[PDB]
Structure formats: C-alpha cells, structure tokens
Amino acid sequence: IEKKIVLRNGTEAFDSWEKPPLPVYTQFYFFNVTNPEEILRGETPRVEEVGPYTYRELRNKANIQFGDNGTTISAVSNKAYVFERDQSVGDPKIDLIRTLNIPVLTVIEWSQVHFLREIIEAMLKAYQQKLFVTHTVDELLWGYKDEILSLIHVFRPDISPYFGLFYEKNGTNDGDYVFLTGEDSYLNFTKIVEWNGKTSLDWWITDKCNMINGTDGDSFHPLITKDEVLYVFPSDFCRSVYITFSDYESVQGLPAFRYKVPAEILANTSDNAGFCIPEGNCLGSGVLNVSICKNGAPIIMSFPHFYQADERFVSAIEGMHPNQEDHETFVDINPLTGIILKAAKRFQINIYVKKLDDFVETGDIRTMVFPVMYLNESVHIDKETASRLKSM
Ligand SMILES: *[C@@H]1O[C@H](CO)[C@@H](O[C@@H]2O[C@H](CO)[C@@H](O[C@@H]3O[C@H](CO[C@H]4O[C@H](CO[C@H]5O[C@H](CO)[C@@H](O)[C@H](O)[C@@H]5O[C@H]5O[C@H](CO)[C@@H](O)[C@H](O)[C@@H]5O)[C@@H](O)[C@H](O[C@H]5O[C@H](CO)[C@@H](O)[C@H](O)[C@@H]5O[C@H]5O[C@H](CO)[C@@H](O)[C@H](O)[C@@H]5O)[C@@H]4O)[C@@H](O)[C@H](O[C@H]4O[C@H](CO)[C@@H](O)[C@H](O)[C@@H]4O[C@H]4O[C@H](CO)[C@@H](O)[C@H](O)[C@@H]4O[C@H]4O[C@H](CO)[C@@H](O)[C@H](O)[C@@H]4O)[C@@H]3O)[C@H](O)[C@H]2NC(C)=O)[C@H](O)[C@H]1NC(C)=O
Numbered sequence: 104i105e106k107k108i109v110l111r112n113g114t115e116a117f118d119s120w121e122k123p124p125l126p127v128y129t130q131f132y133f134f135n136v137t138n139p140e141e142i143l144r145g146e147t148p149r150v151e152e153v154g155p156y157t158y159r160e161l162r163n164k165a166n167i168q169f170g171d172n173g174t175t176i177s178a179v180s181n182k183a184y185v186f187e188r189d190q191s192v193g194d195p196k197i198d199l200i201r202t203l204n205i206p207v208l209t210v211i212e213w214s215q216v217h218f219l220r221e222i223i224e225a226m227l228k229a230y231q232q233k234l235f236v237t238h239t240v241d242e243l244l245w246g247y248k249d250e251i252l253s254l255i256h257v258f259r260p261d262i263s264p265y266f267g268l269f270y271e272k273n274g275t276n277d278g279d280y281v282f283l284t285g286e287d288s289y290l291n292f293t294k295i296v297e298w299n300g301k302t303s304l305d306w307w308i309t310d311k312c313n314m315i316n317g318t319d320g321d322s323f324h325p326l327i328t329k330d331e332v333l334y335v336f337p338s339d340f341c342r343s344v345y346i347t348f349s350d351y352e353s354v355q356g357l358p359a360f361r362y363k364v365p366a367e368i369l370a371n372t373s374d375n376a377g378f379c380i381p382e383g384n385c386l387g388s389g390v391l392n393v394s395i396c397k398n399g400a401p402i403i404m405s406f407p408h409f410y411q412a413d414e415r416f417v418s419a420i421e422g423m424h425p426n427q428e429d430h431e432t433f434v435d436i437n438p439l440t441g442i443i444l445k446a447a448k449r450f451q452i453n454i455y456v457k458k459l460d461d462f463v464e465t466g467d468i469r470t471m472v473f474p475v476m477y478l479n480e481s482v483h484i485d486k487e488t489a490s491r492l493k494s495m
Pocket residue numbers: 215216217220221380381386392393394395399455
C-alpha cells in the first residue's frame with residue numbers, strides 16, 4: 104500500500120511538494136508582425152515566429168498551514184523566472200518585437216464597455232496612439248510604461264501606468280490555495296478545495312463551468328489507471344480542464360502514461376457553451392475569451408498556432424502552421440506514484456481585433472484573433488532523481 108505519498112511533515116513527498124527538486128523551464132515565442140501598415144489597410148497579416156526566450160523557474164510553497172486533523176493543507180505557490188541566455192535564441196533586452204498595442208486595445212475595449220469612457224476618449228483624441236508598436240521582449244513580458252495608462256493613472260491612481268504580459272508575476276503566487284492531502288483517501292491527493300477563499304469560480308455562466316476540478320497540475324494522485332480522466336485547474340487559463348490517455352511512454356527507466364489535452368476542451372459545443380459570455384455565443388472551436396479574468400482586456404487564449412481549432416483561425420493569419428508534436432499539450436505521469444516525469448504545457452495568447460468607426464487607430468483592420476506570443480512550460484526528470492525513485 105502506497106500511503107506514504109501524503110502531505111505530512113515527515114514524508115519525502117511533502118518535501119518534494121514544498122520544494123520541487125525538478126527544474127521547470129518556460130520558453131517564450133513571439134509573433135513579429137511584418138506588414139503593420141497593410142494590416143491597417145485591411146490585408147491579411149503576416150507574422151514571424153521568434154524564440155525561444157528560455158527562463159528557468161524557481162518554485163516553492165509558502166504560508167504552509169495544516170488543519171482538520173491533518174486532512175487539509177493551505178499554502179501559496181511562489182514562482183520566479185531566471186533567464187538563460189545560452190538556452191535562448193537571443194537577448195530579450197535588445198531583441199525587438201513588433202506587435203499589437205495591447206494597452207490601447209485594453210482601454211478602447213474598456214471605453215466601449217463604459218469604463219472611464221470620457222477620459223479614455225479624451226486622452227486618445229489628444230495623444231494619437233499606434234495600433235502596432237515595437238518593444239523589447241523584456242518590455243512586453245515583464246512590463247513597460249505606456250502613455251495612455253500614465254495619463255489615466257493621474258486621474259485614477261488605481262489604474263497601473265505599466266503594462267506587461269507577465270507584469271509583476273515574477274517572485275509571486277496566484278492566489279491562496281487550500282489543498283487536500285491524501286490522508287482521507289489517496290484519490291483526492293493534492294486536490295484543490297478552495298481558491299482565494301471561494302469553493303468555485305463566478306465569472307462563467309453555468310455552475311458546471313465554474314467548478315474547480317482536480318489538482319493544480321504539478322502532481323496527480325497515485326495509482327493512476329489508463330481508463331480514467333484527470334482534471335486540472337490552471338489558474339492562468341481561468342477554467343478547469345481535463346486530460347485523457349494518449350499512449351504508453353518510458354522516461355528514463357520508468358513507466359509512464361502519456362496524457363494529453365484533447366480537442367473537446369476548446370470545442371464549439373454545449374458543454375463549453377457556458378464559457379462563452381454573455382449569451383452563450385462562441386467565437387469558434389479552439390479559443391477561449393478570458394477577458395473577464397484578465398481585467399477587461401480583449402485577451403483570447405488558444406493553443407500554439409491554433410492547434411485543435413477551426414481552420415479559419417489559421418487562414419486568417421499568414422504564418423500559422425500548426426502540427427501536433429510541436430504544439431500539443433502533454434504530460435507523462437508515472438502511474439504508480441502519480442509523478443510527472445516529463446511534460447510540455449503549451450498555450451498561446453491572442454488579441455481580438457476589429458474595425459471601429461469611432462477609432463481611426465483601428466483603420467480598416469479585419470475582425471480576427473491576432474496571435475502575440477505562446478509558450479512552452481516543460482519539465483524533465485533527470486537520471487539521479489529517476490534512479491532515486493526507481494528503487495521504491
Ligand atoms: C469576451 O468576454 C467579455 C466578458 O465576458 C465580453 O465583454 C462584454 O462585451 C459586451 C460587448 O457588447 C458588453 O456588452 C455591452 O455593454 C455595454 C456597457 O454596459 C454597461 O454600461 C452601460 C452604460 O452605462 C452608462 O450609461 C447608461 C445610460 O446609457 C447609464 O444608465 C449608466 O449610469 C452609465 O452612465 C454613466 O456614464 C455615462 C458616460 O457617458 C454618463 O453619461 C452618465 O451620466 C453616467 O455617469 C449600462 O447600460 C450597462 O448596464 C447594464 O448592466 C448592469 C449590470 O449590473 C445592469 O444593472 C443594468 O440594468 C444594465 O442591464 C440592462 O440594460 C442593458 C442595456 O444597456 C442590457 O444590456 C441588459 O441586458 C439589461 O437589460 C452596463 O453597466 C453596453 O453599453 C452595451 O449595450 C448596448 O449593446 C447591447 C448589445 O448587446 C444592447 O443590448 C443594448 O441595448 C445597448 O445597445 C444600445 O446602445 C448601443 C450603443 O449606444 C446602440 O448601438 C444600440 O443601437 C442600442 O441603442 C438603442 O437602445 C438604447 C437602449 O439601451 C437607447 O438608449 C438608444 O436610444 C437606442 O434606441 C452592451 O450591453 C458587455 O458589457 C461586456 N461584459 C463584460 C463583463 O466585460 C466580450 O464581449 C467578449 N468578447 C468577445 C470577442 O467575444
């Protein structure tokens with residue numbers, strides 16, 4: 104019986120959960136817009152993939168507190184990103200990327216939703232902004248000071264003058280989780296019970312879609328069987344998902360089940376209609392409008408190169424060539440212990456753009472989901488730790 108895989112102060116499983124020994128790497132890839140003026144004149148966008156920009160992660164748990172006679176545990180998961188120049192295609196503090204002006208699109212979308220409408224319209228009218236802007240990779244990723252945000256900031260101090268895809272996400276966590284250890288049962292090991300105090304979400308339509316299912320995805324319950332389905336809640340993705348068995352794999356000298364994210368997760372279906380806000384009206388198979396949880400910005404999640412998506416999402420942006428092996432999302436789990444031996448968590452950030460008559464910033468741009476940057480967050484078990492695990 105494997106009941107030593109339980110988060111108790113004394114077991115080695117707890118120490119690995121507290122301080123993950125395996126290094127995790129996130130790699131950023133950007134889409135450099137080659138014809139901005141022609142896009143504003145209503146022509147088909149043309150982009151170039153640029154990457155990787157590889158960062159090593161520093162993971163740990165903090166504010167660790169037990170409870171309920173040892174059945175529950177609460178903590179926060181801090182995550183930092185240390186840059187690796189030699190594992191990267193270039194220096195991000197020099198390498199420039201030309202892409203959409205996300206701050207102006209954000210505040211344009213705010214104004215259309217009547218949030219600081221007069222102030223935004225006034226500033227935009229006085230200070231002309233460009234729809235396409237060029238910044239360094241370090242700026243786009245970890246923040247830069249924007250004009251319009253700075254002007255709004257003087258009127259509304261709560262509004263940040265700086266914008267970045269991962270702004271202030273270095274050396275920080277993503278809410279206060281409370282997990283469930285495997286004391287009551289091994290099946291509900293590292294299972295999330297609440298997040299930021301609440302037992303479920305409240306920005307999707309159906310109660311079904313707002314449920315917090317499964318684990319964070321850093322580990323799974325022991326003794327996994329081929330037939331079952333594993334639920335994951337990635338906070339950044341703003342919904343629970345699930346992964347199904349694909350095929351058999353061996354990592355080092357260890358057995359592993361290859362579990363992937365299936366097409367059903369972002370499919371245009373009734374099960375996923377609840378995610379399509381407001382009136383159950385969806386953009387199409389293979390995307391997720393996450394504007395509600397990204398503070399009103401017109402941000403659309405997808406898989407890299409619109410993998411597992413409607414063909415028209417690929418035809419809209421010249422430069423998207425999706426294949427399985429490069430863009431799928433998979434995880435190799437040791438069935439016995441439920442430990443991730445290898446994985447590639449991959450997702451893409453897009454921006455919803457459309458022509459506006461009230462705005463000449465938009466020109467005559469087409470209505471489309473415009474890709475900005477996607478990543479590969481990956482892990483791989485090394486020989487020393489694998490051989491350590493192999494013994495048990
Ligand atoms: C992704 O995802 C995301 C999320 O999820 C999303 O998002 C979304 O989006 C959408 C888009 O569309 C949106 O929707 C929109 O919204 C907007 C906004 O809203 C808001 O606001 C408003 C306004 O307010 C203001 O005003 C008023 C009056 O007017 C007042 O009352 C107030 O107070 C304010 O005022 C202020 O300010 C101003 C400035 O100027 C000044 O002046 C003054 O003094 C003051 O200060 C409002 O209205 C709203 O409200 C609502 O809601 C709430 C909640 O809480 C409630 O409570 C209320 O009651 C309401 O509700 C109700 O009503 C409404 C009506 O409006 C309705 O809607 C409902 O159902 C109910 O019944 C808010 O707050 C808006 O604006 C819009 O609306 C529009 O559109 C629609 C369509 O859908 C319709 O339905 C409506 O009706 C409208 O329409 C109209 O208008 C327009 C413009 O102008 C036009 O064009 C048309 O034609 C029409 O017109 C007509 O009618 C009218 C009546 O209405 C009249 O007046 C005239 O004459 C004509 O006849 C819409 O709705 C949303 O919101 C969002 N959400 C979020 C969360 O974000 C997105 O989308 C996605 N994406 C993708 C791509 O997919």
